[PDB]
Design a protein around this ligand. Sequence first.
Ligand code: ZGS
Ligand code: LMT
Ligand code: LMT
Ligand code: LMT
Ligand code: LMT
Ligand code: LMT
Ligand code: LMT
Ligand code: LMT
Ligand code: LMT
Ligand code: LMT
Ligand code: LMT
Ligand code: NA
Lengths: 201, 460, 203
Amino acid sequence: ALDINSPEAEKNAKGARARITCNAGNQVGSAVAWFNQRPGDPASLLTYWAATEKGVAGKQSAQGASTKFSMSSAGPEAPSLSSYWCLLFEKGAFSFGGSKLNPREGAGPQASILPPSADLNTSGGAAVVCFLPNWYGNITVQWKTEAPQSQANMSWPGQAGANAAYAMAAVLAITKGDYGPGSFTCNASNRGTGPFAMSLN
Amino acid sequence: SRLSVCSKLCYAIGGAPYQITGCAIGFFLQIYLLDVALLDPFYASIILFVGRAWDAVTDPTVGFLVSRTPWTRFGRMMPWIVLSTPFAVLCYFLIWYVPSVDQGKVVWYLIFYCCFQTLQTCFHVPYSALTMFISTEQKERDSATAYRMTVEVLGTLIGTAIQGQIVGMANAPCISTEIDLQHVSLQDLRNAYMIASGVICAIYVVCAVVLFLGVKEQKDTCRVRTEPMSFFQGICMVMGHGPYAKLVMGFLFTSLAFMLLEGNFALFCIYNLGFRNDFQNVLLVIMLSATLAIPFWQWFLTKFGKKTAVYIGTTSVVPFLISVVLVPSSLAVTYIASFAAGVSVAAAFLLPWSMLPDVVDDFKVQNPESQGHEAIFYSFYVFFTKFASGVSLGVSTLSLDFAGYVTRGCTQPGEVKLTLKILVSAAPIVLIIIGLLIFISYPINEEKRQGNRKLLNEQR
Amino acid sequence: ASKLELSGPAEPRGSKSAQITCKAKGFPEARFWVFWLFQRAAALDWPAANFSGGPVQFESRFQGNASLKGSQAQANAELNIGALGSSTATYRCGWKLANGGFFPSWGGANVNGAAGAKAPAVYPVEISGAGTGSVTLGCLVKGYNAKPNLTWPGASGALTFPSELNGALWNLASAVTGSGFPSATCAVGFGAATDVDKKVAAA
Ligand SMILES: CC/C=C/C/C=C/C/C=C\CCCCCCCC(=O)OC[C@@H](O)COP(=O)(O)OCC[N+](C)(C)C
Ligand SMILES: CCCCCCCCCCCCO[C@@H]1O[C@H](CO)[C@@H](O[C@H]2O[C@H](CO)[C@@H](O)[C@H](O)[C@H]2O)[C@H](O)[C@H]1O
Ligand SMILES: CCCCCCCCCCCCO[C@@H]1O[C@H](CO)[C@@H](O[C@H]2O[C@H](CO)[C@@H](O)[C@H](O)[C@H]2O)[C@H](O)[C@H]1O
Ligand SMILES: CCCCCCCCCCCCO[C@@H]1O[C@H](CO)[C@@H](O[C@H]2O[C@H](CO)[C@@H](O)[C@H](O)[C@H]2O)[C@H](O)[C@H]1O
Ligand SMILES: CCCCCCCCCCCCO[C@@H]1O[C@H](CO)[C@@H](O[C@H]2O[C@H](CO)[C@@H](O)[C@H](O)[C@H]2O)[C@H](O)[C@H]1O
Ligand SMILES: CCCCCCCCCCCCO[C@@H]1O[C@H](CO)[C@@H](O[C@H]2O[C@H](CO)[C@@H](O)[C@H](O)[C@H]2O)[C@H](O)[C@H]1O
Ligand SMILES: CCCCCCCCCCCCO[C@@H]1O[C@H](CO)[C@@H](O[C@H]2O[C@H](CO)[C@@H](O)[C@H](O)[C@H]2O)[C@H](O)[C@H]1O
Ligand SMILES: CCCCCCCCCCCCO[C@@H]1O[C@H](CO)[C@@H](O[C@H]2O[C@H](CO)[C@@H](O)[C@H](O)[C@H]2O)[C@H](O)[C@H]1O
Ligand SMILES: CCCCCCCCCCCCO[C@@H]1O[C@H](CO)[C@@H](O[C@H]2O[C@H](CO)[C@@H](O)[C@H](O)[C@H]2O)[C@H](O)[C@H]1O
Ligand SMILES: CCCCCCCCCCCCO[C@@H]1O[C@H](CO)[C@@H](O[C@H]2O[C@H](CO)[C@@H](O)[C@H](O)[C@H]2O)[C@H](O)[C@H]1O
Ligand SMILES: CCCCCCCCCCCCO[C@@H]1O[C@H](CO)[C@@H](O[C@H]2O[C@H](CO)[C@@H](O)[C@H](O)[C@H]2O)[C@H](O)[C@H]1O
Ligand code: NA
């Protein structure tokens, strides 16, 4: 197979321009197709060969001679912030790479720890939930039950339509017999030059 | 005060760059649009139809515009040639240039092949009319036409020898597909096509400079005639004659079969025969055999008459066209069939011109009043040989699109190779058989009445 | 126009076999290679291609796992998936342009190869007691095997996180940034009859 590689899985673009790059593992002879998939929709063909469009908006252009290809969105609007895929059509085994556009925002994370309720503690469980509702970038969550823990499950949404900020919920599942370790703390590490710690005892 | 050998040589050399562009386009434009320009074969069918068809249309229109050209300070035909060469070379270079257009390369190519047809038409129709202006002696015009025929055959040989050996020198990688499942670049192939087109454009210019310097028009102003598309009763008079029609329909169908072969033999050599690297050598061997078989058929039309010459000359390619699609792509079989196909090409494009003066004498015997019947016969043949070959090439590339022609490809599916076998083996044999059946219905019966018509030439 | 209509989402149970159909409209199906793709959470993969009047060509990873078939009397192309367990994905059937190798039209049908069928449990996770400005309330939905729908009575500040697998069931959480707190409740709708709405109390 041919190792088609889109390096940036996430890109930042607001209204100016976007250059989505695709590096092939082989000289493919200017045979690269560009698809656009929106969430909840199948992929739609944008470009094929070097720069040939297929019934799409004129902002989508493409370039690349061999082993390095680019798709330019010179007019990036709200529908243009979706996932894009570069495909080879040089050899029989077809391969894709994966990429996505995002807007640009500021900074500032949040954190809020929530203990298990009485209803969950009645039916043999204890889930401590750390909500991280608004931030921009990449964030990490550390759970400390007076010791590091690696039994928590994390979930992230996409980027919000209004605030243009991400979110994160981390759930720590602990049984009733293991529910005496001291205090539970949730630590958030973003680009804010310091972790934000919430705790409950 | 006749034409020198240098003036006839310059007039002859001025007709070569053309044949060169005709052989380059007619042998390599389909594979350029399909494999090098990376077009959809529907768009390639559109371009290959519209360039030839529109071309044929412009031929009588530029003939009419040339026939009303007044006498300038340089001549009646030299201003058209001189003012239309530097635009024709630009359009010819931009035919084989692949543009960086995000949508609609078909519009770019459609513009050039067609514009080139107009421009070249504006170069060639005054050039064809120049034979009536170079000299007032009919023997001088016949010697200049013989020189022109020799340099046209040589430029037919050179045009597949420069483009073929330049664009075949630098190859390109091929595109595997699902049927294929279980350092040279594409840009180097495009650069080779640009280099070949630049060499052909340099030849064009050089020969246009030679034609401008070495040929004068003598300011005769002692004759007048009609124009193309001004009248159409002469075409009905020619088509009302029996042998004239029979000859034009036979030569038509035969030229249609061999133009279909010329258009679609490059793809047959690349994919069916597995000769993606050495198809240009096969085309060069075909052109060398067609060049070397012309004195053979010139001796054959005198040794054994002309009825058997056109009966077996145009049908000698039939078992070899069966054999190329009935063997599993052997190299020696390909080369011997290339030699036989070149011999048949030389026969089919030489021997109707040997048949023609007998029909001219028969028409002079039938009609004492004759003016421009040969010119309107050749104009009718040309247009059709152009329009119907454009139809054939468009139908061929559209059938490739329907069959699922992978661009480049390294292996075509069984549907595409069957269409190539039909397009080089079924349809040209059918057109050759139809042309032979038209040649059977021939009331002139070679010289056996035509010499009696020559006695009619002694009568009038 | 040219379009491809598939079947609905399917839920095979562990090691069943799942047949995904793809009915074509607007072109002769015997002329084009009808493909079959594989979109995981990561990216797009490529199972195989099928010529409806001829051969089937597989990827080496999917030989023995996939089985492409073509019914040309019903303009239909089908993919049969054998043993599963991690083939929870979205399968497309976008056919190929006969000349190029790219896919003009496309498809989309989910496959969720898991086991179990249970009603969700709703827990009103609330604040510990501290307060500074706006309050953050929560709702934890744990232990179901379908797609839920979480709601709040006319308040638009909610973030409903994507569900995740834990064991054989799904876990989901929802957060609301509400300034004033007279009364807040969390509504959960479900495919089964589990429309339970729970109020969020203090402490
Ligand atoms: C194994 C099979 C081999 C197959 C084919 C070989 C084929 C060549 C066919 C013909 C050339 C004949 C060469 C001798 C001169 C005869 C006149 C002639 O060559 O053809 C007359 C004309 O009627 C066709 O004109 P054409 O359209 O081809 O050229 C125009 C160029 N352009 C398109 C740019 C305007
Ligand atoms: C895409 C390219 C298409 C082809 C390009 C052709 C453009 C040039 C057209 C020129 C064709 C002939 O051009 C036209 O010839 C006639 C000849 O009677 C000239 O007509 C004039 O000149 C002659 C000579 O004095 C007089 O006898 C005549 O009475 C007078 O009307 C026109 O002044 C000229 O415009
Ligand atoms: C590239 C596409 C174009 C291909 C064709 C290009 C050449 C076309 C034929 C050349 C004729 C040029 O156009 C010509 O110009 C001169 C000067 O205006 C005029 O020609 C006239 O000029 C003088 C003065 O009247 C007289 O000798 C005579 O009446 C006539 O020759 C006409 O207008 C036209 O005959
Ligand atoms: C004897 C030979 C002499 C030849 C000398 C002439 C120079 C030849 C060099 C090629 C120059 C043309 O180059 C070509 O021009 C067209 C102009 O529309 C460009 O096309 C450009 O404009 C069109 C709009 O019309 C856009 O749709 C297209 O996206 C854009 O790329 C091509 O991108 C470029 O590749
Ligand atoms: C880019 C292309 C490069 C081409 C290089 C140039 C090639 C050189 C051309 C030489 C061709 C010689 O052309 C030669 O002319 C004489 C005329 O005197 C002909 O000789 C014959 O002509 C006619 C036959 O129709 C008779 O009327 C005449 O009696 C007889 O002499 C020869 O049959 C022909 O072969
Ligand atoms: C009189 C004026 C007209 C002159 C026209 C020019 C005629 C001379 C053409 C140039 C000579 C090229 O001739 C051609 O060269 C190539 C080599 O590159 C040969 O090709 C040969 O070598 C290749 C190796 O790649 C093999 O496929 C095979 O051994 C053989 O086909 C052809 O057999 C020969 O026909
Ligand atoms: C009248 C008789 C005519 C005989 C033939 C005359 C021309 C013969 C062609 C020989 C030159 C081409 O041979 C070889 O081609 C490749 C292109 O594929 C060139 O490669 C280069 O081409 C051009 C040169 O500016 C560059 O833009 C390009 O980046 C580079 O690839 C080589 O430098 C050359 O050595
Ligand atoms: C006797 C006189 C005739 C002698 C030969 C004259 C022919 C001149 C053609 C020479 C070939 C020039 O070819 C040159 O190569 C480079 C290779 O990157 C190409 O440049 C190309 O690079 C990339 C490729 O995707 C693109 O940005 C774009 O298509 C183009 O700029 C051009 O095609 C041309 O600028
Ligand atoms: C008579 C014998 C001589 C024949 C050859 C004479 C012409 C030689 C030129 C051949 C190569 C042409 O190469 C071609 O040049 C044009 C610029 O003009 C470039 O065209 C490009 O120019 C610039 C960037 O450079 C941009 O506006 C745009 O991307 C495009 O239009 C192409 O990238 C290249 O493919
Ligand atoms: C006198 C005028 C000309 C008359 C003769 C011209 C037609 C000759 C009839 C040939 C039979 C046509 O029938 C056609 O043959 C090809 C053979 O590859 C077959 O084509 C089928 O089989 C091949 C494999 O063998 C597959 O690769 C292909 O995808 C599939 O379409 C079908 O059976 C049918 O589509
Ligand atoms: C004088 C000429 C006589 C005929 C003129 C007819 C010209 C009509 C213009 C073509 C418009 C429709 O053209 C037809 O539709 C589809 C989509 O619309 C085109 O597009 C098709 O091929 C392209 C490849 O380039 C694919 O990217 C695309 O997915 C596919 O649908 C084809 O080019 C053609 O099959
Ligand atoms: Na033509």
